[PDB]
Amino acid sequence: GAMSQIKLTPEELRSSAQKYTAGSQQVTEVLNLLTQEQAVIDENWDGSTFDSFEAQFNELSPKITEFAQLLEDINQQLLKVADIIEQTDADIASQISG
Amino acid sequence: AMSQIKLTPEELRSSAQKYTAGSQQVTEVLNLLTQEQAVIDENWDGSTFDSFEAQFNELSPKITEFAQLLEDINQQLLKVADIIEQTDADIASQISG
């Protein structure tokens, strides 16, 4: 099971996790910023010139939100797994006598 | 249809900069974490992480498309700013001359 299958240490799992949460946050910020820019362009440039970019942005936008959410979910899984593994090491050290 | 475009060339260019910067940032995150997904895959035997792998893989091409869209918007904003800037110059010269 996992104790056999996982080769990353708790520390390695935590270092990987940090990359995912930082990327989640960065993606969210980009999307939030450019959502505002899209609205500014829409309001301050009358007509249909950017209608196709508007539709494409709006179609992709929820995928970007999902991606940010996925990256954060992965951070949480890796942190939780790291804690379970670290406690396993401690429990073997305390409970096993060999 | 009004002809008026309320954003000035300078304003259009400031917005374009945000699109291309955002594009780069999204691509960097996808690059870094594509590589980290392969680390996890190689260092976690079996199928336990398979769903997170599938979820990442399904979204990845959309992320690449998004980053390209952002670059495309940048490019067209710069093009429109240049058209407007010439027009502004031609009107200013016409009125002053």
Numbering used by the authors:
A (entry chain C): 0 to 97
B (entry chain E): 1 to 97
Please give sentences taken from the publication describing this entry:
WXG100 proteins are a group of proteins of approximately ∼100 residues in length that contain a conserved “Trp-Xaa-Gly (WXG)” motif. To investigate how specific sequence motifs translate into specific structural features, we determined the atomic structures of two representative complexes, the heterodimeric CFP-10/ESAT-6 complex and the homodimeric sagEsxA assembly. The overall structures of the two protein complexes are similar, with both forming a four-helix bundle, in which each monomer consists of a helix-loop-helix structural motif. However, the novelty of this contribution is that by using the iterative bio-informatics approach, we can show that the WXG100 protein superfamily can be divided into three subfamilies: CFP-10-, ESAT-6- and sagEsxA-like.
The sagEsxA-like proteins form a homodimer and the structure of the sagEsxA shows that the driving force for the interdimer interactions is principally hydrophobic in nature. The side chains of these residues form hydrogen bonds within the hydrophobic core of the four-helix-bundle complex (inset) and the presence of these hydrogen bond pairs between Y18 and Q36 is indicative of the anti-parallel homodimer arrangement found in the sagEsxA subfamily of WXG100 proteins. As a result, this conserved pair of mutations can be seen as a fingerprint of anti-parallel homodimeric WXG100 proteins. The CFP-10 subfamily is structurally more closely related to the sagEsxA than to the ESAT-6 subfamily. This is reflected by a root mean square deviation (r.m.s.d) of 2.07 Å for a superimposition of the core residues of CFP-10 (residues 11–83) and sagEsxA (residues 11–83), compared to an r.m.s.d. of 3.43 Å for the equivalent ESAT-6/sagEsxA superimposition. This result shows that the homodimer is stable, and a FRET pair homodimer can only be reconstituted after heat dissociation.
